[model samples]
Target: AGRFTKVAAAVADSVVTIESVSDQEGMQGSGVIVDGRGYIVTNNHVISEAANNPSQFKTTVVFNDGKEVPANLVGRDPKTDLAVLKVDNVDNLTVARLGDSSKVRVGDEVLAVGAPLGLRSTVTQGIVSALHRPVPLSEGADTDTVIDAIQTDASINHGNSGGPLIDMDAQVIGINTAGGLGFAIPVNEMKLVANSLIKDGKIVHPTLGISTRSVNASGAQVANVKAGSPAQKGGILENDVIVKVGNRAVADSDEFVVAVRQLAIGQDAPIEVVREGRHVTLTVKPDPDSTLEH
Candidate 1:
């Protein structure tokens, strides 16, 4: 089709070969030039599991005029599933035009541009299925990310991670991270996390020291609280029925987990719980987990 051809023309040379050792099955994903100074955007999972030295991971950038070069990983944000790499030896890199994800309404036409199933730099069209979609960083695991994502039905597959989900205007609105139902971190959040990671080498997040699960089919049950930890110091107890955090009412433990993951370090936050149908609001300071200490 003519549209397919146009998509190919727009992206083929912009796609780069990702070489990662952390990839248990070997590296296979697309990368896009995000910063004009050689920085490329790819998936966090792609670079996260690589065992090779950072200098060993390679990126082959083929420009429209037929040029290619090796690149290096600059920063990887696991929580958001985004990675930034750079190719200094390559010239005339095509920087993707960025877009405002907050302005994207449901059902807006969009395109997923990336390598899907090892097919390089392909673009598929679809409408935005949902906005502010929250996917658990891990299913059935507690360490989930609080990513407010854009969901699309575009056919994103295995190798599609780390590519750009662009709008009709060819602006990068989201960075494709995971799919079954396509989920991506919005460009706005990506900028925030990317800037912090690139400059600081770590993403700072607040923590509430408690493991939880849904309880009574009504609220979240605090399974356990860290001893001598912030939650314990603040009087969080086992089997506590967590009803809300601040003004946000929670239906299940995952919501509570998501809520906790969004806090900024050292900020004071209030958790509302229902114990025997009596409402109690607990003031807790969101602090860095002590268990992370050596």
Candidate 2:
């Protein structure tokens, strides 16, 4: 973030304040204006109140030049801690130029944007500290919102959720989502989730067509292998207890899903499961999950 004054000026207007208050509580965070159509990107936690009860919650977006517009919750996905809000019939919005987050390396200068009160904007400077850090957003029973995040030492505050992590090139590289110890959901992942939210209103996670019902200390128990699914195609059978994925030894059900989620869509991985007390090896290439055609 050395000499980032000009860099900040270029993208500052793109950062807007998202404020939502429900009967339960009030939440506020920052958002990035991604498109000219008033599609602002922010964290789901920032507007979870709005998502929970949009009919009762008051959610609004504050522009850079002291204009407030009531926001509509376009879409929300906690799995990625991302949400897109739309402000109707607004103008003179500065959109953030998205950059290639994959090009960001450790030691890259970055800026974390924040708008706590919608009146004052806060910007913190730091460098990319680490990459591929797993940041879990929710601890629900089976829903995994684990983000393979980019860690930075930008000193992000609690109010910085859904803010943009701007690179020295002045490109919006990542969206600030979690940690101090700031961890950002990479812009690449953002585009994937954000686009889906904007277009499909939901996320399509990579699926194996096999569900885990139970787990043992030894491995995850496989159940309900869908016909012609990736699991069935990979030769995984019902009642097969998965003990290994690829070369890594899986410990339990949680690890099993996490490992599967980590597998790239085109990645082929070996699966090891125990059937009839005998070890078996299978391979699978994951496919995007669908309700019917899948």
TM-score for each predicted model, relative to the true structure: 0.83, 0.77
**What is the lDDT, from 0 to 100, of the residue 227 in candidate 1?**
77
Expressed as tens digits, the lDDT of each residue in 51-76 for candidate 1 is 23444444444344545556666766
Model 1: lDDT equals: 0.68
In terms of TM-score, how similar is model 2 to the real structure?
A: 0.77
Give the per-residue lDDT digits (tens) of candidate 2, residues 25-103: 6767899999999999998777775677668789988887878889888787776688899999887778888998899
In angstroms, the error of model 2 at 264 is 7.1
Q: Pick the candidate with the highest lDDT.
A: 2
Query: In model 2, which regions exceed 4 Å deviation?
Result: 116-122, 139-144, 209-259, 262-269, 272-280, 284-294
